[PDB]
Amino acid sequence: SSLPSYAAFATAQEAYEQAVANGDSEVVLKKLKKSLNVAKSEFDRDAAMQRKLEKMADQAMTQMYKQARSEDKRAKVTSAMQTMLFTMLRKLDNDALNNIINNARDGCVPLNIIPLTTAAKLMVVIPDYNTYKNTCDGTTFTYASALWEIQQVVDADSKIVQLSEISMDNSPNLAWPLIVTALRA
Amino acid sequence: FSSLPSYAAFATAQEAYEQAVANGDSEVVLKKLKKSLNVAKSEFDRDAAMQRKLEKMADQAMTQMYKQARSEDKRAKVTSAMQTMLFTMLRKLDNDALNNIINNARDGCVPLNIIPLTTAAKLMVVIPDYNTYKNTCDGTTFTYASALWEIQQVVDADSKIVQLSEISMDNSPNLAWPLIVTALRA
Amino acid sequence: DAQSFLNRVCGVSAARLTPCGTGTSTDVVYRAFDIYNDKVAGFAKFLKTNCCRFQEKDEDDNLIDSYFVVKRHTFSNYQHEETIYNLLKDCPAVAKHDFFKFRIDGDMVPHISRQRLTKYTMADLVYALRHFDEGNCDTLKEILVTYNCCDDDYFNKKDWYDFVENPDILRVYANLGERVRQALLKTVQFCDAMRNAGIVGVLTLDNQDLNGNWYDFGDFIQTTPGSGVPVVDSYYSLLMPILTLTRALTAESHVDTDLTKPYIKWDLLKYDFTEERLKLFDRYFKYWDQTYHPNCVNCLDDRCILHCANFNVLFSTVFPPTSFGPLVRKIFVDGVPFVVSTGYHFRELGVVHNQDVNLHSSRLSFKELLVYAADPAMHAASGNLLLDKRTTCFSVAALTNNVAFQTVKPGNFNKDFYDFAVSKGFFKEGSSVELKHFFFAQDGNAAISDYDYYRYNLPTMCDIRQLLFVVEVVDKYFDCYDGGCINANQVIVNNLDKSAGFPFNKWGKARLYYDSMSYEDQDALFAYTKRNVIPTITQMNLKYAISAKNRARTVAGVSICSTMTNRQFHQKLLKSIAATRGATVVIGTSKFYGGWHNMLKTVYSDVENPHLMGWDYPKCDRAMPNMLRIMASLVLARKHTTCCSLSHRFYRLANECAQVLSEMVMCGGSLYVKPGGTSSGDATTAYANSVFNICQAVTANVNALLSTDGNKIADKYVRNLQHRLYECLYRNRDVDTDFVNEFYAYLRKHFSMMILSDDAVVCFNSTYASQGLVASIKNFKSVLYYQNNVFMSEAKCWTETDLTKGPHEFCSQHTMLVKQGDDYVYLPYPDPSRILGAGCFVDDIVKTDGTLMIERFVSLAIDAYPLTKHPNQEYADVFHLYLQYIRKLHDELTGHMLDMYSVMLTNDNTSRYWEPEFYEAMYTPHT
Amino acid sequence: AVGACVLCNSQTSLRCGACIRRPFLCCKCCYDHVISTSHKLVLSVNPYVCNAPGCDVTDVTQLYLGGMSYYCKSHKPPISFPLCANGQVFGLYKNTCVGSDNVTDFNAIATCDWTNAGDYILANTCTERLKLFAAETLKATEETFKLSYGIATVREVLSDRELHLSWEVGKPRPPLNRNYVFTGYRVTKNSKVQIGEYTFEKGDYGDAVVYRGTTTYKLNVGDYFVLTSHTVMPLSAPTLVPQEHYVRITGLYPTLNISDEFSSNVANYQKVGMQKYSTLQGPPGTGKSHFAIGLALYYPSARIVYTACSHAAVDALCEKALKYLPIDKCSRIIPARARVECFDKFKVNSTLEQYVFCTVNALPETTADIVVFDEISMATNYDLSVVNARLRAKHYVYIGDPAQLPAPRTLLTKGTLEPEYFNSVCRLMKTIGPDMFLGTCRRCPAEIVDTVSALVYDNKLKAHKDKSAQCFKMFYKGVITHDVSSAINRPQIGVVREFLTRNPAWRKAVFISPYNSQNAVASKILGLPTQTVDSSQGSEYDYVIFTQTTETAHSCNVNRFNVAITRAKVGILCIMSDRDLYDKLQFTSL
Amino acid sequence: SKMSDVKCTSVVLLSVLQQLRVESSSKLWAQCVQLHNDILLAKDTTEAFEKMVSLLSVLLSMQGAVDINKLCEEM
RNA sequence: CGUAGCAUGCUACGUCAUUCUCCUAAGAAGCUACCCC
RNA sequence: CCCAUGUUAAUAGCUUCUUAGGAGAAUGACGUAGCAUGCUACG
Ligand SMILES: [Zn+2]
Ligand SMILES: [Zn+2]
Ligand SMILES: [Zn+2]
Ligand SMILES: [Zn+2]
Ligand SMILES: [Zn+2]
């Protein structure tokens, strides 16, 4: 294992190999055998101590690794979950989830849970005449890849407006985050 | 275990052997010194093993005592906590009505299920919807357990207070419904 | 002719009669006899052919429910019954007979015409309510309709017979109340008019028409007047499960016992109802032979505790429910007043008082402090009154100042593994392996909309002359084990870092209380619970673990002052059950290392024509009646014939029944009263459930063997077995251990069983169970209907006609006969979707990491190895998916641990967890 | 525990523990930091000390790792390897650490103790991580400078209203003011625990304090008072968010016909809406703090957080907003301690309200829609990083002038700091130009604003006014008394009192004095409302009385006196101890 | 393979909503849990998506808890 | 040839060092049954 | 030569790792006995 005890073991083993090549002696051969054995015992004690140290320095490598990674994983979880969620939502590529996401990136958020049953109520803000021009048309409202009929369009002052004030020229006269309250159709 | 005299004997036998090697001592001196070195070395190694055994046993006993001291301290800490809890729950008792009803019993024993019903000064009614609210505690002074309770607070599921005029059949959906209404005996 | 006969049957009570049958001949009817003679014994449906029953129609030609049975028999029986009727004439509970001799064809036959009997005699009601079968119940629908309980549209409902899917059925059955109770009262008139007239007879059930009258005096020998004796051993003991199914003792709750009167107003502070219980017993069950001590602390042994306990579980449905529970008393400690519980008053074992009450004490040790901090006397007495309208259960108090709502957050997601799974071709459309086991979330009020399921626990008066034999057979099933009290220093706690009850979890885990108390004051506590009662709050908390259906799973954590003593009491028995291999209760037999094959080959203990069968108790831990839990805790406490006296084996039963059966559940910041049923959190729950399961199986066997047609049983040994089983049930009062041994040998030769707490597999002889001599499924449905009080639909109990396929599902692991080595073994394989659902959905965001948990996918692959031998392919791919994922996990682990440090692990031995030899070695019988 | 290097953001687990802030450092960067400076102590997951029974060598150019421990040369294992080698120091992630060339700036920031002027000019021009580390290290140095302060105790208790003092000999005396709170103890052989937090304010007569505090517990002889520092939490957010010129107004919706006063600020409002953050610069009293409220009134639907570094500035912004905004949608946030009183007119401490007003060091973790940071000449990079970390908004405004008085900078005692090194925003304004610039003094009379246009500006500021005949200067000397570094001048207050009843129209003339003790002791003499020049930024007063209390290098600075004089709405009386300042401006002789 | 990708995305989405401290609004957490449990049991893809839309609308409803413009911009 | 002294080789027992196996106890991490299908 | 600040049960089975103890086996060093052999001396 390349330590001085192994150097002594190696030179003693070479001497014993030379003796085996000769192989005609008893007393000096036995003395060489004893020297090889005692050097081997010393080397094996050193190797046992080093191997115990080397397998003790793995219960402090694995433990440190799975403490560092655990403390990294449970401290970065408010962001890992959100990045994972939007990765998966981009993976689904559904026509509805993508539509409500691509609207909610442009201010057009919904102010309550989007309903399911027909003729149920949804209140969604609209931040511009551009987003009102895309989603709305006449008394129809294309949101979450479904058509809704508009009940009310209340501006930021909570004063009800009609769907004829909202024109290209007459756009900037209102308080723009219009809450549109619509029913599912 | 170098402190024991066996280590000194092993060291001086090694020193004698090294002196024999350096001075080129004869076979008789070498064999005598080697025999002495062998017996001294074996005795020192046995002594070192015994020292390891004794030191490990002492460390085991020290850890045993420094764990039992922690255990015996935790015993006193939890005993203090239990005594504090018992005496606070004692001082919270409505110690007049309880005494009256207990001394009103034949042997001093009353079932536990009638200890709140006839002594507790506060009543928490938990209501799951509106029909139950209308049926059990309509108005401001309902009647439960043959006593006249008066409503003093109505908190909703997420612990927000609610004024008793917001609870109506046309405002029922807009609440968080399990409605803990806290009332007092009157 | 057939008109003079009708004119004679009309008699003096001029009633218009339409003849059932035809033409002065007998009418053959399928009735429900309770019969015992030399030929046949049992309680079964026979076919009676000696009754020319007419029907009485009132004005407007409506057929009212009142018949004229005209039983004809030998002349000797006619004369004997004439004298007996002339002795019992005056009492009201004797249907008016009319004896007349009529020329039938060429000679005079003597007829004994009863007058105005109802159609279905009482045994028919009891039979059709005990031996229910949803396909063939026409003698129960007709009884319910004809006594104005339900109006014949009730039976068009989807599940009208269920107790779990239709609780309103109870309101139907209760409408028979004052028709059964009156029956009971009329019996106590008859018995009196029997004893005062000197007649010795057997009161069978099938001689009482549903009005109450009695009409059969065949085998009534007569003796010196005023010294007769009526035998009601087998009358009050078949009618007993009907006295709380149909709630026949609620009219005893109204003042003057009239259903029109208002409720009675018992005093609030009245806890000793012993005189009232004795009054009820001497009014209804007067001529019941055995004694009856209302407070079971006076009882003789564990067979006079079942008897009096089952009586009290009926007599305690008329006393107010706000008078049970602990009995507090104001004591003084160093001149300051505590209120502590000095007893209990349970509806089953009466009133129990403590014998160690130390008023005017000075200090408090650790034992006394623990006892006073555990029991709910202080906690209820120092908390504000609560009225919870969300639950039909009681509501003792509210400890905090605001009710706490607990949610169950959704599980995490192991997206690395899910992307790996969809890489290897899983989770396609049409795959036989699909994600079904998810991590479900829960609303705010879940823990209190699940505790509400204890509304399924009705007070059931289990039959008592048959429970006192089923307990003997069950005890024979439990005869190989040894048990007893162990000293404090021999208790072995598996896990010590588990929370301890309500009042102790604010300060530490169970380790704190198992380390703080020395052995002396941990053994003084146990020698204290053997001489008085420690009531105990038990917390009810939601479990956060993978599942397959929405309903929240609440587990009950019992206080350390209860577990710390139940361990000492029950541990020798509970660690000799879990260390004996080859018995009925297979708990502690490993499914690895060829242990599933050994289970499945010690089930087939030489039964002639095997058919495997498995039932499933619905709401097992919430609908188990109180009496069966007491019987389970009395069979688990029969080993103490030397270590404990009798008054030490009664206060242990009272402590188990106060800390487990009927406790105070702390259910989200409020103390409710738990009506009954086992709380799966104490020391003896798997084993107590095993005892109860064996009790239901043996009860189904007894019912199936008794309720056969008697003379259709060709095997002249089994017929004698039935004829002696009835005798040892009802006509015998002490144990008959030779016959109990014989019947248990019959059971283990023809109904070999394998029990894991409710998971049963039975290897019943199929020829016998086809004849009816061994309980098939339908008998288990009936037994669960009248004893466990739930209906077990036949779509959740399986029957395997083959044996080279093993049990369909035991311990939630299917079984497959695979070829291993050179023989054939039964490998148990799990649901191949649960393994995926437990790989993808971990319950802690650190387990999402992957490379940390290789020693978790190793365990999952070990559990999912038997899938590779499945004949399907999408099942056999789950194991190889786990192997390839462990390989990827270790590759990226070494990548990260080489980037982090600069040298890889040296002594690394993870190269055997991704090769199938290691997993295959775990299903081979060597070790 | 691992982290990111400061100079290169690589992964690492080495903390150069000799530095005050204990920063993380990669392998190569730590090697360059220890090869150059005198910092030799590198705490890994376990500290790099010679793990011998007894041995104290902590340098990490010597220690060699052997077995599982680090040993010096005198106890080195027979088999081992040196740590500081191959151009690296052996820590975790030894092979994926890309070095950085900014090691010299890191050395200059970590080594210096913030006493030389060039330390600030270097700590405010480097990269973002170095800017954050420099600000964090300076705050840590300032807070640990309170560890060098003294300890008070009691010999006798005069009353429950006034307490006697006994300072511990051998430590400097902590000055008596609002900031330096005290905590009680009783270490007489038992109970070495805290009892409560009090505060000191010196009485007029003798050497005693009319103490106040959270509680009113009686101070026994064993009890005594010590001061402490809360913490220096590490900042993480960048000093300035990356500017991004949007195409159109996004996130803010304008209004029709805003008003009559703000009609000249619509262009600036739309410029603020266009960009991400914006910078406004103007001479004092020129609508800078009012243009922010006009922006709030021009974006009614936008949730706005106003914030300032001090309390008087945010309170003045509060009162002006209340004079211009509805109190239905308005709030204010105060701290739990609140060593100074607050503006209790809004519905105090409601975060969810649309218009949240606050101090930088007390902001909540919240979103907004546009946050107006006022007085960016009174904030260091710690304040900007806190306002960029705690709250997040779609539009930032930074409104203030470089030439005002800077942050106090306690640690600095040599040289004078140029304005363009005050903080990052002042650098952005004085180098590349402010985004908006409005100069016409709508505040001060033409006399004093004409005077202050000649001293601290290049005679360019103009105002719409004329001489108000209420601008007086009184030449005096005063006897200087230097108590606790909070200077007090005796006859200035007497002169004011003798010439206060001469003109009873100055009854509410707010008193401005550079030192806090003059302010505190002048309350019982004159009775006028009063404030300090450092907190004088933001508010406006009708008649002002500004006194150069003691002629030192403090009050001789032109910026402090300029900020003092440009607070006078209609009247100003200034008493000067400087010979030049009495003739530096141009007033009536008086 | 898109039916069993709405059962997992819904788990991640409800975990996100729970991390946004939506537990402390009982009337809203009841609806979020109901939509989660009804997504995980629905065997029809259209029903699962129409409940996933309503579950996501809770996340988009809260104005500035998540930062939707930054999150989606990583495309 | 016995005995004494010394030396060499061989068997039994004991001390120590190393390796391997098995078991017994204690501690920590994880999974499954349990739970509803 | 001084001035701003604080937002979650019981029981059972199994896998992996660590420590301690015991036993066994193998090798080596050493010690003490017993057996054989070789040399010198006295008798
Ligand atoms: Zn009895
Ligand atoms: Zn016992
Ligand atoms: Zn350094
Ligand atoms: Zn670096
Ligand atoms: Zn050293």
Residue numbers in the entry:
A (entry chain D): 7 to 191
B (entry chain B): 6 to 191
C (entry chain A): 3 to 929
D (entry chain E): 1 to 590
E (entry chain C): 1 to 75
Original authors' sentences:
The SARS-CoV-2 genome is replicated and transcribed by its RNA-dependent RNA polymerase holoenzyme [holo-RdRp, subunit composition nsp7/nsp82/nsp12 (3, 4)] in a replication–transcription complex (RTC), which is the target for antivirals such as remdesivir (Rdv). Translocation of each enzyme opposes each other, and if the helicase prevails it is expected to push the RdRp backward on the t-RNA. This reversible backward sliding, termed backtracking, is a well-studied feature of the cellular DNA-dependent RNA polymerases (DdRps). Our results establish that the SARS-CoV-2 RTC backtracks, that backtracking is facilitated by the nsp13 helicase, and that the resulting single-stranded 3′ segment of the p-RNA extrudes out the RdRp NTP entry tunnel in a manner analogous to the evolutionarily unrelated cellular DdRps.
Therefore, to determine the structural organization of the SARS-CoV-2 BTC, we assembled nsp13(ADP-AlF3) and holo-RdRp with the BTC5 scaffold (hereafter called BTC5) and analyzed the samples by single-particle cryo-EM. The sample comprised two major classes: nsp131-BTC5 (3.4-Å nominal resolution) and nsp132-BTC5 (3.6 Å). Analysis of the two refined structures revealed that the RdRp portion of each structure was essentially identical (rmsd of 927 nsp12 α-carbon positions <0.3 Å), while the disposition of the common nsp13 protomer (nsp13.1) was divergent (rmsd of 590 nsp13 α-carbon positions >8 Å). This region of the cryo-EM density was well-resolved, allowing identification of the t-RNA segment engaged within the helicase as +14 to +8 (numbering defined in Fig. 1A), 5′CCCAUGU3′. The five-nucleotide segment connecting the t-RNA between the helicase and the RdRp (+7 to +3) was disordered and not modeled. The −1 position of the BTC was occupied by the first C–A mismatch; the p-RNA −1C made a non-Watson–Crick hydrogen bond with the opposing t-RNA A. The next three mismatched p-RNA nucleotides (+1C, +2C, and +3C) trailed into the NTP entry tunnel.
